[PDB]
Amino acid sequence: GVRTSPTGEKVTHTGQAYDDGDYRRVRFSDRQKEVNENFAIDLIAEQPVSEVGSRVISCDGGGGALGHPRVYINLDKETKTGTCGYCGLQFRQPHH
Amino acid sequence: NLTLNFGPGVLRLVMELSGEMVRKCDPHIGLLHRGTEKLIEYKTYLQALPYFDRLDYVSMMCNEQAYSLAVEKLLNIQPPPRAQWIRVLFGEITRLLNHIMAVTTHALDIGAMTPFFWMFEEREKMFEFYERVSGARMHAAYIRPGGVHQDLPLGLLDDIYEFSKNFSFRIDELEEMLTNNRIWRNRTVDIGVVTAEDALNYGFSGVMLRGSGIQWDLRKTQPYDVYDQVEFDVPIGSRGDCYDRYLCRVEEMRQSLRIISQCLNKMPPGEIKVDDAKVSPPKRAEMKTSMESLIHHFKLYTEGYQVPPGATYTAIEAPKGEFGVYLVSDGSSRPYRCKIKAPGFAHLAGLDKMSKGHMLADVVAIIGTQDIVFGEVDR
Amino acid sequence: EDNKQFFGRHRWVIYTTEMNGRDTFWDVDGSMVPPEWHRWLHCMTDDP
Amino acid sequence: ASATRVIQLLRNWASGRDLQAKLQLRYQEISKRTQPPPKLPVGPSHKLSNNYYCTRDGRREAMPPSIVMSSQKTEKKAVTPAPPIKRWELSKDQPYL
Amino acid sequence: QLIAVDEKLDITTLTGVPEEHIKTRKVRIFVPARNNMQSGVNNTKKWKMEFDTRERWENPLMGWSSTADPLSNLVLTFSTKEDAVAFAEKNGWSFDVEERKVPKPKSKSYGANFSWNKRTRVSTK
Amino acid sequence: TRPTIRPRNDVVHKQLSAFGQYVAEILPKYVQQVQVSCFNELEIFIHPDGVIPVLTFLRDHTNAQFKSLADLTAVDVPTRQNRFEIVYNLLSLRFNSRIRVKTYTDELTPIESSVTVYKAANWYEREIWDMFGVFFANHPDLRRILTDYGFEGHPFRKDFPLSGYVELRYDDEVKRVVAEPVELAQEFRKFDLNSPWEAFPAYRQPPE
């Protein structure tokens, strides 16, 4: 989800872009500015929420030892969904 | 009596010559002083380990092993048998590399340039072994104060054996080119003669002692890892000159091949680092599965292990001589003081006495036979 | 590949004459190899 | 090596040895660059019981050095730091090179 | 064989420190305060000497933290206050000494939790 | 103990203790303390005036004959009145043993050079002078050995800053390399790694 600053420069996923009066834009003249086109926040927002019929489930990021440390997520609260603090995947009980 | 300066490994050398004779030889060092010992005081022990790769940068894992032994002695722990066997095997490989570099560079400075290429092919093969075991060709950082970082890949031993069964012919070719050549003997025989008592009083060690007939080797008198479980002979000189040291180094290469054979045939099973997670980090699966393992990994990679207070001097038989570390611990995870002892320091200090009454061309031969690398000399 | 050559010479790449935007008929370099063929060509694996 | 027989004999005579027995260029005799997965066994402290850390704590067994005649606080035979080192033996494999 | 000279120790001319890093600096001699995030007290055993904080600015490239003083990371450890004071004096540094803060002893009584008539009785446990 | 713990050697410990008592008895004028560590290392603490006598005795005595000087260095402890301690490491090939001799000095008290006892000490004392500022009396030629010419200060002192005071660059106006005060683009990040909850109860100090 790369946006463009009113100056014209691409806004990176950290949201920074040199101001109009910033002299530091001169470093990009006759050259380019590296911006990563894949925004992690959007990509993890596109992941569907997993449906599990268990009160507490574990997430390790997939791949077993190739993921993140295994953590357990509580799904008692129905207002929101359980989110992994490492991977960002979302889990939810089958309401109704 | 004219005074001239051989300016800039890298060495500045001030001499006064009376015709062809060398009257005084004053080496000037510090052109590669990077302040390693002060930098170590600002690092943890694991963080300070990679400095020893760069100290004597022709024999990397030997310095790694010396530092690891010092830290193990201060921690009051021991590595597992397989780690010790791996350490000795790679120390012998490192000795082969170092002696190849020393002999071929000494020949190249005299004017024999072809064995340099001949044996640097073998050096490249051993660098491939280093890269396969650690991921880096030279600045390996493989030997750790708890053992070794990773286990050997599943096909490393067979390739090491394949390399070791062909190296003796390379040594034979080097000997055919150098050993009986009359020009080489005229360049080396009776050059830089040092007596046994003078070598002892001047702080010499290793080949510099053994070429004068002193029967001393740290792997034999004070064995450290498994060196009491392997069999080899110690070459002893008879005249204390450059030729005897050359012969001694070639014989040490052959004996290193012997020790490598024994190590390959007697590699034991088991773990590679001390099974104590408060010193050695746990496995990745354990760190990603168990709470204690994750806590210990976090603490070992952020703070590092604390070492009980004390001071030790640990020395090993490095390929260049006695390499020692005087390590002081104040009880924290950072060393308080780390003094690094290099044999090249004393050898270069004795260079002045070794070169009395010799030609200007003989000083190059004496420098080559002393096996001086300025990374360890300047630190 | 040629398994009868000695190790190191048993695999080689003939570079293309025109990659993304430059004519590489004469100007070739090692960074022109994509990662998978990079892994195969550096003998990190035995499988193309 | 893809060397003709005449060149083989010429180089063998020039060096004075048999070179095809020990070649310095690697060939198919080396190990495969793809290997099966390993297993890497565990250490001795991987037990589920009788494995208290207090019984295997190397760091906590270190103690301050023993004090000998702190100055601030009989026959008596003479002694040496260690017993005299034994003389080495002359390598009954190849005593002289 | 002994001079027996009466003069306070001064080694400023031998340390090689520049002139403006001797007279304009103000070292602080103190026992570091306990990190209130933790209950351990092993970091409040020794005396510390640190220098006054100087300017830090943003590097125009990388936005890193740049400094112009060499003494921004220099911290010394001392057994006693007198040792630190002597070291500061002999090095020609103006110093400020802070007296050690010790947690005063307190009276703890588990039986006071279940009090018959005092306010110390707890409502839950 | 268990296979993760380093084994002890009581025989070497007893031998080193006996030899330390022997040396202390022979030289009561200079020996102040004798220690043997749990990993079998013998240390002898002496008065500074006894450097030459003790070292000569250890080199020349029939029962000691420590003929090799392994290493000579200094350690800086700012909290002591005598700031520096001088450490001598000696090796005896006759008895396959090592010994350590420690003394002390401050910034202004010279230490007698031991180049007459060991020729190897020549460069070690030069290095000590360069890195710590400890002067050695009757040295053949005492001068800097590691630092640059004209370098001011002694870097291995604890109060010397890690990056020093001056830095070098090439100046085109004067067509030579000049020295200027250090200015870091990125300051060295100081890390507070020491944790509370003391680790080794055997080394606990009295609370005074």
Added chain:
Amino acid sequence: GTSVKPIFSRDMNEAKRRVRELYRAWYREVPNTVHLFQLDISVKQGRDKVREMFMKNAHVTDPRVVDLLVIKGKMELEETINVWKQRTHIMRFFHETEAPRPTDFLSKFYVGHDP
């Protein structure tokens, strides 16, 4: 009390004698250093620099510090005479590339926070 072991000088008189000997040697050496290093400075300004370096330590009242300073200066002279230094080491005494730092309060207030 306050009995200390001497380095070279028991009192201040012989310490000043060594100081004067070192000053004589440096004063004699200045023209040879100026010629041999092909310096662009004059002999007068080199001797002025020597005098200034000697005067920076005029406040010392400890004979041990004085004779250690003499030892350091003699090492400096040995480095200069034997041409162990290059021209950059000699010229580092003059700080030609360093912009002057004004001393008054207003200038320091304007430039930054450094007192």
Added chain:
Amino acid sequence: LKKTTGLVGLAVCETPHERLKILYTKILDVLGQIPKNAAYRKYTEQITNEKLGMVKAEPDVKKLEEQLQGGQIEEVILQAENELSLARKMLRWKPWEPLVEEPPANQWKWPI
């Protein structure tokens, strides 16, 4: 008679028994001028008397070398010379006297 002891700079000594006897007698003569209660004198007299009795009771050179536990009797002679020189130096130094002075209060306290 053997030749080339094997240590560079160490010459072969013919008739080493007489040399050892002379050296030990000179060592004992020097030790005689040291105070009787000094530990150095007692220990060195014991060691020197043991070696001298071993030398005077063994005519065979190789058996004497094996008994003396020094080996290569040439450096046994060298060590005797070193002991004699050290004895003269010890006589001048007089280190059997009490300690010169105690160190400061916390000179050797480690850690800190």
Added chain:
Amino acid sequence: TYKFVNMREPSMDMKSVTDRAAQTLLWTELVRGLGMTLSYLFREPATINYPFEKGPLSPRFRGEHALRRYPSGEERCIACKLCEAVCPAQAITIEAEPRADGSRRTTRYDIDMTKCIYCGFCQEACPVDAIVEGPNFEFSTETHEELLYNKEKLLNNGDKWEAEIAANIQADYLYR
């Protein structure tokens, strides 16, 4: 056990003296050395045809640094700063804050490649395999500035080399 290297006494009979004289006058050993060089002349050299041929490498080998991400596309880094703490050269600079969705992510991740020692401590300290040292080694630069990597450059390196990086990790992760 010890060996003597130079303890051979030449024979003094007439035949051995004549042999040594013939060696001195007719230069036999020099002809032997010439023959050894001639024998080397007629064998295959060890040269490889760079850049068309490459030197052998291993999965363990450490190359240019890269930042990886999960199969879903979110970056693995959680800003724990363990790699920054362990870095022996202080080559890593990290700044972080909660993201717009509340995730724990970095806003700055800088690696100074002119300060890095390529030890690989950072990749073995990372608990989520976020920072790795990939197999690329041909990334020489014409200026100092382009060797000061920021987060965008490292994420681009990860996206560029992910296939080979993942294959190497699959090959080597059972040894770690």
Added chain:
Amino acid sequence: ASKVKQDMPPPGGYGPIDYKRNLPRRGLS
């Protein structure tokens, strides 16, 4: 279930490794 598998010498060990010097004598009196 799965047994231990790591880098080990083959059963019976490796073959002997030549290490002694081999400088042959060609022949001419």
